[PDB]
Amino acid sequence: IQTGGKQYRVSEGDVIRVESLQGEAGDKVELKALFVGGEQTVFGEDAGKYTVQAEVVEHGRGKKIYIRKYKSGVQYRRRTGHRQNFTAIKILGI
Amino acid sequence: AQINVIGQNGGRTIELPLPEVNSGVLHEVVTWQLASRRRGTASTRTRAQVSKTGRKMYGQKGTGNARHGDRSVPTFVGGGVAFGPKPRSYDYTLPRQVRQLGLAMAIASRQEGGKLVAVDGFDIADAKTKNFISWAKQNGLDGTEKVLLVTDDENTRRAARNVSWVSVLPVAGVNVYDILRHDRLVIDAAALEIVEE
């Protein structure tokens, strides 16, 4: 989201911005802002009681993009590469 | 700090360049050596002048689309090579002391590995060549190394024509290039190898 989840997900291995806890099963606990676990809907701080459990699957570089910039009649042309670093996390929590 | 091979066993002499050799100074040397050897032949009719072509064309205005003088400019296919190569030098005078420091420093490199001082090829007998290979075999000269022979014996030289081995160098007319170019230095004839200044 803004980094570090929330919500009633399931057992999904999603991709988020780098977490620092290097290598497999580095274990991550999430704050939680809403949930539909057992159809029961609860939001903010009342959801804060509950938490999500994640397992750091992998560390990777997101598909290469190219940062291109151009200004006319000023002879301004720019070319630079980019790859965004992520941390893949397996969800398996409350 | 170096011994001998055939004829005696002294050697020991010479205050060889400090510290553990400088590549930068050898670099300065080789460059100069190759710069001097470089022939200055530069095949180019650079000038709009030098190429074979007339002088007026297809009038200044109203021909509709052009503005040209004559068929000899560098913008023309077949014209001059404006800024092309012309015969020149690249030979310069590398300071004396740096040339002296050069080969001394280069010899030092051969001391830190495989150096070789000899007194006469009485171990040769005629030119024969087959017999130079025999002598070389006795002193670890198998052919796995490129070798430089610096002898004044006109016959021991004559027994140097072979492959991945030797380049034969006369009357202490040595080179920082030649010694670095080969793996081992058979410094041999101890004429320049001892006594100067």
Binding site: I1, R68, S72 | -
Partner: protein, 117 residues
């Protein structure tokens, strides 16, 4: 020595001429026009990266006030409720709830109505 262009230009040219895919007419076939098109494409590329971010939030907001109005409210009011119920800090996700979970969306409308009036 002489050092003619040979191979360098054609390679330089093929690179550009391959970025030119579903480029109409000359824009995909002739170098100068293919290349020229790309300068302008660069403007669109760098701009549309930060633009999609306005584009989506727009779509997000539209879906919110649609559902907010389904339960006699509106985006302006609803959001203030969730803001006034400091506890509620969905912001991101909030549009999907309206669109997929109507049961859940209603709960958040009802909470928003409290924190307000």
């Amino acid at each position: 020595p002489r050092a003619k262009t040979g191979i360098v230009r054609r390679r330089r040219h093929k690179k550009v001429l391959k970025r030119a895919k579903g480029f109409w007419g000359s824009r995909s076939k002739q170098y100068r026009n293919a290349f020229q098109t790309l300068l302008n494409a660069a403007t669109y590329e760098y701009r549309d990266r930060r633009n999609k971010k306005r584009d989506f939030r727009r779509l997000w907001i539209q879906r919110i006030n649609a559902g907010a109005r389904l339960h006699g409210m509106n985006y302006s009011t609803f959001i203030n409720g969730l803001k006034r119920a400091n506890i509620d800090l969905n912001r991101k996700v909030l549009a999907d709830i309206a669109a997929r979970e109507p049961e859940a969306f209603k709960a958040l409308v009802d909470a928003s109505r409290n924190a307000r009036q």
